[PDB]
Amino acid sequence: LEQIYQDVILDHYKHPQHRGLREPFGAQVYHVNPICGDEVTLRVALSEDGTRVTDVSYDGQGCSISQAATSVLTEQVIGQRVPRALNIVDAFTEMVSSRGTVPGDEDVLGDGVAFAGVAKYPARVKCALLGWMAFKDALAQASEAFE
Amino acid sequence: LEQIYQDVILDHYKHPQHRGLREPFGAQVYHVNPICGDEVTLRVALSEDGTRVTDVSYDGQGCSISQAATSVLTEQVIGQRVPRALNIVDAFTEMVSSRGTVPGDEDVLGDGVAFAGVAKYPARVKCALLGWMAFKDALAQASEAFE
Amino acid sequence: LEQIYQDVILDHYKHPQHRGLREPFGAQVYHVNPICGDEVTLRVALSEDGTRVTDVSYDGQGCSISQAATSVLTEQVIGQRVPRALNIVDAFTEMVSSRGTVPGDEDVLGDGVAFAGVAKYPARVKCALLGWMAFKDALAQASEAFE
Amino acid sequence: LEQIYQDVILDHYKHPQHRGLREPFGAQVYHVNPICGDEVTLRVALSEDGTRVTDVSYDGQGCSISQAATSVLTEQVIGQRVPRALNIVDAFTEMVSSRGTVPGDEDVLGDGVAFAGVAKYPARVKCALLGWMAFKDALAQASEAFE
Ligand code: FES
Ligand code: FES
Ligand code: FES
Ligand code: FES
Q: What is the DSSP string of chain D?
A: -HHHHHHHHHHHHHS-SSBS--SS-SEEEEEE-TTT--EEEEEEEE-TTS-BEEEEEEEEE--HHHHHHHHHHHHHHTT-BHHHHHHHHHHHHHHHTTTTS----HHHHGGGGGGGGGGG-GGGHHHHHHHHHHHHHHHHHHHGGG-
Nearest-CA distance from B139 to chain D in Å? 10
Chain breaks in chain C (C to N over 2.5 A) after: none
Experimental method: X-ray
C36: how many CB neighbours lie within 10 A of its CB?
24
Q: Any chain A CB within 8 A of the CB of B36?
A: yes
CA distances from C61 to A79, C40, C115, D56 (A): 42, 7, 19, 20
Check residue B104 and give left, alpha or beta (phi > 0: left; psi -120 to 50: alpha).
left
The 8-class DSSP code of residue B19 comes to B
Phi, psi of A71 (to 5 degrees): -60, -50
Sheet with A39-46, edge to edge strand ranges: A27-32, A39-46, A53-61
The terminus-to-terminus CA distance of chain C in angstroms comes to: 43
Describe the crossing of helices D2-14 and D64-77 by its angle, rounded to 10 degrees.
Answer: 80
**Residue C91 near residue C72 (C-beta atoms within 8 A):** no
Instruction: Tell me the C-alpha distance between D104 and D72, whole Å.
Output: 14
**Residue C74 near residue C17 (C-beta atoms within 8 A):** yes
What single letter denotes the amino acid at residue C24?
P
Pairing of strands D39-46, B53-61: unpaired
The 8-class DSSP code of residue A141 comes to H
**Residue C144 near residue D49 (C-beta atoms within 8 A):** no
Tell me the β-bridge partners of D81: D52
- Nearest in space to A131 (alpha carbons), one of A75, A83, A52, A51: A75
Phi, psi of A131 (to 5 degrees): -75, -35
Instruction: Tell me the C-alpha distance between B143 and C14, whole Å.
Output: 52
Instruction: Tell me the C-alpha distance between C114 and C99, whole Å.
Output: 15
- Resolution value in angstroms: 2.0
DSSP element (H, E) containing C27? strand C27-32
- Nearest in space to B42 (alpha carbons), one of B55, B53, B57, B54: B57
> Torsion angle of alpha carbons C66, C68, C70, C75, nearest 10°?
-170
What single letter denotes the amino acid at residue C141?
Q
Closest CB to A23 among B37, B63, B122:
B63
Residues 6+ apart with CB under 8 A from D95: D102, D103, D104, D109, D112, D113, D115, D116, D119
Instruction: Tell me the C-alpha distance between B42 and B141, whole Å.
Output: 12
> Torsion angle of alpha carbons A128, A130, A133, A134, nearest 10°?
-140
Q: What is the largest CA-CA distance in chain B?
A: 44
CA distances from C125 to B92, C35, C138 (A): 53, 12, 20
Instruction: Tell me the C-alpha distance between C6 and D23, whole Å.
Output: 13
Q: Any chain C CB within 8 A of the CB of D2?
A: no
Instruction: Tell me the C-alpha distance between C66 and C60, whole Å.
Output: 10
Question: Residue length, chain B?
Answer: 147
CA angle D13/D15/D19 to nearest 5° reads: 85
Domains present along chain D, CATH in parentheses: 2-146 (3.90.1010.10)
- CA B130 to mean position of chain CA atoms: 7
Residues 6+ apart with CB under 8 A from A51: A81, A82
- CA C96 to mean position of chain CA atoms: 12
**Residue A130 near residue A94 (C-beta atoms within 8 A):** no
CA-closest residue to ligand 3 atom 4: C127
**Residue C40 near residue C31 (C-beta atoms within 8 A):** yes
Q: For residue D49, say whether it is annotated as part of any ligand binding site.
A: no
Burial class of D97 by CB neighbour count within 10 A (0 to 12, 13 to 18, 19+): middle
Q: For residue D36, say whether it is annotated as part of any ligand binding site.
A: yes
Instruction: Tell me the C-alpha distance between A146 and A128, whole Å.
Output: 29
A146: how many CB neighbours lie within 10 A of its CB?
14
C79: how many CB neighbours lie within 10 A of its CB?
13
**Residue C131 near residue C13 (C-beta atoms within 8 A):** no
* Chain B residue closest in CA terms to A21: B63
**Residue B70 near residue B130 (C-beta atoms within 8 A):** yes
Pairing of strands B53-61, B39-46: antiparallel
Q: Ligand 3 in contact with C57 (CB < 6 A)?
A: no
Burial class of A35 by CB neighbour count within 10 A (0 to 12, 13 to 18, 19+): middle
- Nearest in space to C143 (alpha carbons), one of A106, A125, B88, A121: A121
Phi, psi of D7 (to 5 degrees): -70, -40
Instruction: Tell me the C-alpha distance between C139 and C47, whole Å.
Output: 12
Strand residue runs (E) in B1-147: 27-32, 39-46, 53-61
DSSP element (H, E) containing C142? helix C125-143
* Chain D residue closest in CA terms to C6: D24
**What is the SS3 assignment for B59?**
strand
Pairing of strands A53-61, B39-46: unpaired
**What is the SS3 assignment for A38?**
coil
Strand residue runs (E) in chain A: 27-32, 39-46, 53-61
Residues 6+ apart with CB under 8 A from B107: none
> Torsion angle of alpha carbons A146, B1, B6, B10, nearest 10°?
-160
Instruction: Tell me the C-alpha distance between D124 and B97, whole Å.
Output: 32
**Residue A44 near residue A135 (C-beta atoms within 8 A):** yes
CA angle A64/A65/A67 to nearest 5° reads: 65
Q: For residue A38, say whether it is annotated as part of any ligand binding site.
A: yes
Q: Ligand 3 in contact with C36 (CB < 6 A)?
A: yes
Residues 6+ apart with CB under 8 A from D147: none
B50 Cα to the center of ligand 3, angstroms:
44
Instruction: Tell me the C-alpha distance between B87 and B108, whole Å.
Output: 8
C36 contact residues in D (CB cutoff 8 A): 27-30, 41
Instruction: Tell me the C-alpha distance between C137 and C143, whole Å.
Output: 10
What single letter denotes the amino acid at residue A134?
A
Tell me the β-bridge partners of D55: D45
From the CA of A35, which ligand is nearest? 1
